[PDB]
Design a protein around this ligand. Sequence first.
Ligand code: MG
Ligand code: ZN
Ligand code: ZN
Ligand code: ZN
Lengths: 67, 115, 98, 48, 44, 477, 51, 34, 404, 257, 98
Amino acid sequence: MIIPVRCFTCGKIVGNKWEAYLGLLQAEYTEGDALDALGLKRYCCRRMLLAHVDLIEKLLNYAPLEK
Amino acid sequence: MNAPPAFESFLLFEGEKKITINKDTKVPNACLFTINKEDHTLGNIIKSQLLKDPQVLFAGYKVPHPLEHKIIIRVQTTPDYSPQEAFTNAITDLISELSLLEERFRVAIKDKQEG
Amino acid sequence: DGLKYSLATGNWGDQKKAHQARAGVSQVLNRLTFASTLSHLRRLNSPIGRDGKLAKPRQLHNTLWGMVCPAETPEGHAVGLVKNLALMAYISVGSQPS
Amino acid sequence: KNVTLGVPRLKELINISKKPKTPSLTVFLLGQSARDAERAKDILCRLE
Amino acid sequence: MIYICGECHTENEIKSRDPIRCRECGYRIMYKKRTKRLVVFDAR
Amino acid sequence: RKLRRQMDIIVSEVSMIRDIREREIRIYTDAGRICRPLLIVEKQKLLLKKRHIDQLKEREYNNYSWQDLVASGVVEYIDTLEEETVMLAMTPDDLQEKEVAYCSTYTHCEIHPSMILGVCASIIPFPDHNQSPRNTYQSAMGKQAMGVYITNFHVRMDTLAHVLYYPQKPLVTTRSMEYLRFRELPAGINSIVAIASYTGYNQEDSVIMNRSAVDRGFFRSVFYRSYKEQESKKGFDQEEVFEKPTRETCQGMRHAIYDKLDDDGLIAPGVRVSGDDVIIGKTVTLPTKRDCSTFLRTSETGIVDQVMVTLNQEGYKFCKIRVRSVRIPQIGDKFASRHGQKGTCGIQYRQEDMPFTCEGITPDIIINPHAIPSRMTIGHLIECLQGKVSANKGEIGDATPFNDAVNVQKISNLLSDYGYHLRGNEVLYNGFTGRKITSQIFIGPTYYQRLKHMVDDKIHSRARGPIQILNRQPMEG
Amino acid sequence: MGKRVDFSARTVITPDPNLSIDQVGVPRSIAANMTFAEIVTPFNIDRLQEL
Amino acid sequence: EITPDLWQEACWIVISSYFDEKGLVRQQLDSFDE
Amino acid sequence: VIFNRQPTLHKMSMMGHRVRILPWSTFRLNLSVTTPYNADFDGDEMNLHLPQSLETRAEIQELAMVPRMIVTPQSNRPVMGIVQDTLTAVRKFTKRDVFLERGEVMNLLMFLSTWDGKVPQPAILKPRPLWTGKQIFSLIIPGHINCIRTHSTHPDDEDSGPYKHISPGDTKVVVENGELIMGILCKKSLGTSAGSLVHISYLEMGHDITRLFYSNIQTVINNWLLIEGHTIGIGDSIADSKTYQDIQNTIKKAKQDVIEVIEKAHNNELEPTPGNTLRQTFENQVNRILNDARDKTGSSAQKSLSEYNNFKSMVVSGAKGSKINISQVIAVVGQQNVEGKRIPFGFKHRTLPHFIKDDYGPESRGFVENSYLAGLTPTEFFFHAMGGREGLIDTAVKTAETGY
Amino acid sequence: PYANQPTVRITELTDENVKFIIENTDLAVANSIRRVFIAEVPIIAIDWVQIDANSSVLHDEFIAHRLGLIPLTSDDIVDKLQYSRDCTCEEFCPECSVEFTLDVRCNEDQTRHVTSRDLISNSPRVIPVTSDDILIVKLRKGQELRLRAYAKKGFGKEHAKWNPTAGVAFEYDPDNALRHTVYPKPEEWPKSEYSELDEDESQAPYDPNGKPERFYYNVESCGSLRPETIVLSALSGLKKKLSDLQTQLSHEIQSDV
Amino acid sequence: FIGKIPIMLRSTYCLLNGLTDRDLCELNECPLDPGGYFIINGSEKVLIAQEKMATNTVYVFAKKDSKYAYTGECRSCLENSSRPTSTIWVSMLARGGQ
RNA sequence: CAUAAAGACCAGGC
Ligand SMILES: [Mg+2]
Ligand SMILES: [Zn+2]
Ligand SMILES: [Zn+2]
Ligand SMILES: [Zn+2]
């Protein structure tokens, strides 16, 4: 759906690191370089960004109930 | 629907005593403490502190079930020494340690910054 | 009303003959998961009765290599009698030998 | 030699079925036919 | 009673024992316009 | 065969068979034959060459697709009873190349063997490392996993809709999942899993969940129930009308609260509705009035999401109302991995009490090790290692069933370089006393699926309630 | 020969090692609906006036 | 003009084109269309 | 409350219990009661029946209670035994090597309900006090109970010569005067079998104290099981780099022998065994060779196991799993069979399109060389699925006839 | 028969991290302190959420859920605030609560990101940890979100949103003398960052007389509490509990006798 | 006008065919939905492929207790143009007749 | 305190 705040296992904040993450991937760095540049060390944090699926961009295509 | 509210863990409602004390008839000079609304955080401390006292023959705790928040601590001491006194002395010693640890930790903080 | 009916109820045939008519066709599609939907859309149903305790209608035959999934099947009286399809399987739709 | 065992044989026993799937008869030999395989072979020919 | 349209999203005022067709889009499906009275959530 | 490979007089659909000992020659143009494509081998060499893959990798904006690959005579459709006349090779670089002679004449080679697996069986990482009944059990359970089923679900009105908050594509995925669209609509979440016997609440198939993760949104879902309601005219003067009943006008009256209804007898969305709460007021003029009004399913305790009012086939006013309830995973719910290991949650421990590594990581989910030996799912262990490599490396691992190129030993040698014990074993500290746990517990992320089955809907309790009409016995259901 | 009966509650089971052999965990809802009929005596009349 | 030992790319490119032209449910659509 | 799971096969599937109210949604029961109901915990439900009269409550209490039903009249064995974790932790806990410092003994004694309150004097007094696993477990065994059993790994050599009572492997068992002298417990001791320590506790002492025997074992050996912990990991499924060459050598030997036999049968040199068709004696010989192979490789993989390997920890105590599973994991999965025979010919005189017609060799007919750890080949995977389908079908079909 | 006197070394001190070493101490005190780092340290996080107009594609209590997991700056006023249960007045006062307000609508065609920076507080001392931006939700044009929230004082026992810290690393006896864990093959295991030993030898020789000391800690903050005051607040709270036991304990021993 | 035939979604005669992503979003349809099912009375029904024995080919089987040792048969249809089936058996009486 | 019928088929659970 949308990236969770507060990584499930440890509780670090991954919720603000999604957008900027994409930016890194948009330029050069592979995921291994981007996740280290964002400062996620223990892999319980890394699985938040690495395994995430963003469905919000899919849900924002359909027009809302009110114009 | 049957989930208990977020506090059965610490908050005490009407009538529950924090500590209840029951003597143990299986052994002379042995007592049993029941601590409502606590878990291993406190019990492990108190048990490990009661094992230093040379007059304490037995010290142990258990949670009879995790979904209930309770602690049972059995204490057996040497003759002419009440186990309640051993438990009080244990708590007082624990405070005497934690205060010192706070102060030395503050000194360490103030030293690590421009020291 | 005939097409709509025999698609609606799943009893397949004349409705006054529904006793003689075969049933089990056109179940409601499962919306639990997109995988469950893809599975329900690709499926086979053997007409052999479910109650029968005889084996080998049921068992896994060498002719099922690659056209039908060896692993996937319901569990119940239906073991081996309902067969999901392998990914590359394509049913020939038919033509004239003109 | 094979024998029906388990649930099907239990059905044959409990039902007291007229014709079982694997009827079998064991045969023992009194004399020198028992120990020697020759006379045993003779009885083998006489029972078949 | 205000029903939001399901086509042009133009709110219309309509009353009981009336057929439902939204004016100017001629569309037959309306939605109920989330209520007034306020409901509390716990952030848990 | 030439004319079919060129598709001149013969559609590629037609199958042709020469049975040599019976001297027959058969040609089937019939409908219903199940057939699959295969590569074509002339002598020892494939007809698929480098220019074909060059154009297929450039497939976008070349208007060059699979149909032009069939029109080149490279690939060919073959059905069952023609496979009796064919010789297949598993992979070209293995069975085509020369060794101590087995077979020369090979006429075909399968595209990739893992395509023999169906849709639900294609989501299993390393299915060949598992006992086959577990691949079957997983093909059964994978249909029941909660997730985001269709992206338009906000528009749709459906009964019994389960949706998961935070779906995740797996860390260990099969190459074929890409074509099941399982990246866009995953059902499940990855989790950190230590396989151990801990407090004894995971014994049998049960599973110990971290509660502090459950409070962070882990396996927390939404349940949409839909409610259909029909206004109609049947009798001459007898009609049904949407309206808010008044305490004494209508005949049938239940002590439940009608005060949530609006002027038209329909609850506005955003109202909390509980057991006995009355969603739709509906009355029937009585030749004064009768109450046909509809009630929630008992105890659901939820909020009205959406209310829509329309005209049906006949043209009467027809109202649908969708209530939704959020369900937090309990110690009664049912959780299954991707290999066929399923079980309930014995109990939930907070992050305090969960066993922790040197680095502070605590398992979200603990499963009992006795599940492994008899059930014989090793692909759960191998998956659990490949995910532990895949999380660190930044790459999503490849579990596709037959590589021959992914050894357990290679995965271990790749893990040992990141600072871990190469077998996945890792030192844990006890949660309660902080003492080290003597044995070294096996930890790694594995992808887990919440299941439709939940204890809140399976609980029932009975004291002297409604009674069957004919038998004067308690009701059924 | 068999029939649907009252004072019976079905639900899912979960392992608790901390009970005894003959005990069982009962959720509070199943324990809320299911009742036991009781006779009032001079012994229990106080407790039953409490309940 | 061969593709040895690079095969793991080839098989999945051709599978890619396959599921790109058709899809999973094509049996239904071809049955109903004919 | 009487308590039930469908179907009820025997009378131990309905047993009266003693209510205790707990949070959340689910019934909860001790796991020694697992085996009577056949239950495991995945989605299992059980009915709860409440007696409404004091008369019927007395009947249930003096007839259908669980502690009274321990020993079954069917097999004159105890129904309930130590199962899953607690049995493995009993084995590992009962070894000589287990030594316990003071506080650990304080906890384990704290979880004994029947304990007198008198701390036993440790096995090692000096330099530091150490209790032993057998020394605390001797406090569990109630009253004075007398039993002699033998551990699973106990060989038959120790009985013949010297070390009858020493048993260098710590094996056999002795329980005298309510005390455990020696021996390692397993499914053959605390588990359910004729004359097991629990059964002897039932007949000699009674049901009341036997219940507390179960419960005490459960609690104390779980709460000790926290300390060492138990696990399975890939390192437990891997053998030595030598054992792999051993196993593969044995396999290639076997397949070469099969080639020799088949090439004998092509020249007609194979003589039919009396009472057997040439196909029957051929399949007999090949089955002999292949079963010899998989058995030998199995025994090798079982000799390659370290004392630390956890597969051995589960299998030796009989808690769960069996030696054949270790064999299939480490060495060879083995021959797959459809309807009691080697994989048939679905096609015309061949099993799959890949194999050549009239191939009776080990690979074509479904002998699986690979192991679950290394992973199957595709054809061995399909043959394996065929082998499992028969099991699923038997499971589904037998139940109706058995119930009828 | 007396309490040991511990010591502390602070090695790394940053705004995200603290590495300190407690020496000459029991194991249970260590594990209990690292436990108080999670459980009992009070913090401010949003609890009470009321939504007015939600047109977003995310349903109400999903967003209301995600508002509670946003860290708030707890560095100062947590000592001042009172638990809502101990508050005198009905409902909410400035003593027991902090009010946050959210007003967003998307006028422009481009998607708008509703982030914690949009949350507005009545008091300056609590920012949503903005001195990047935690994403609350996204909004298409025409979509709108307006809501009130009250944040309270709570700690990690209640709900995980009150955990002040991220993963807390705890270690002792890094080179294994005490044999509290037994490696089947010691030569296969990498060595801890605190290892004192040469790289040729796997382990330290067995010490029968030793007991665990020199506990190595790492405390990584969530941003609500600066990691220097997480340990102080923790020790203060734990000590407060112990003093409470001494109190009510003494009262019981006096009353029953 | 003889009658209305239900339409399979996303087939050639559906209104959802040929439409790209944006159009399907304006129409509140999911681009991922594979289609291939029916909508009758609001429910979504899926015709399940029904296994049957092939037609026009001669078969030979042997039943245990039959009067026949060998039964060949042809289940035969014409083109699918008309009629359900016509089943003809050609069998060989067992020589075990006493 | 009463009404929501019954039956049919299908899917699933152990
Ligand atoms: Mg079960
Ligand atoms: Zn993390
Ligand atoms: Zn409109
Ligand atoms: Zn206030």
